[PDB]
Structures are given as C-alpha cells and as structure tokens.
Amino acid sequence: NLFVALYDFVASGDNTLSITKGEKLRVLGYNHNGEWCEAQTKNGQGWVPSAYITPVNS
C-alpha cells in the first residue's frame, strides 16, 4: 500500500488532500466507486483522485 503521485492536485475542501508529483503516500482505502481514495502523507490526510497515483516499485 505504498504509492507515488503522478500529477499535482490541489485540495478543494470536503476533506481532500493536496499532493505533489513524486510524493509518496500510504493508501488506507477507497470510496464506493473507486474514484477517490483515502491517503496519508507528510502534509496530512484526506481524499485524493485514484487516477492520480500508482504503486511504488512496479
């Protein structure tokens, strides 16, 4: 469950989390439709787009 951000995403409220391209993140789970996933980084925790991340070392 260790992942890397592919693109920049800026948080928009509703418990979303900003992520920076190249940042590593731990994934805690997904929403009903897979589109959003709950991450933790060095800057905090929150929802990020699933399509914006990929596993490390694959």
Binding site: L6, Y7, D8, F9, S12, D14, N15, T16, N31, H32, E35, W36, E38, W47, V48, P49, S50, A51, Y52
Partner: peptide
C-alpha cells in the same frame, strides 16, 4: 468521500 467528480488527469 466527495460526491462530485475528481478532476481529469492533466
């Protein structure tokens, strides 16, 4: 999670 759509990859 948010009810709205996430933004498309840039």
């Amino acid at each position: 999670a948010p009810s709205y759509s996430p933004p498309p990859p840039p």
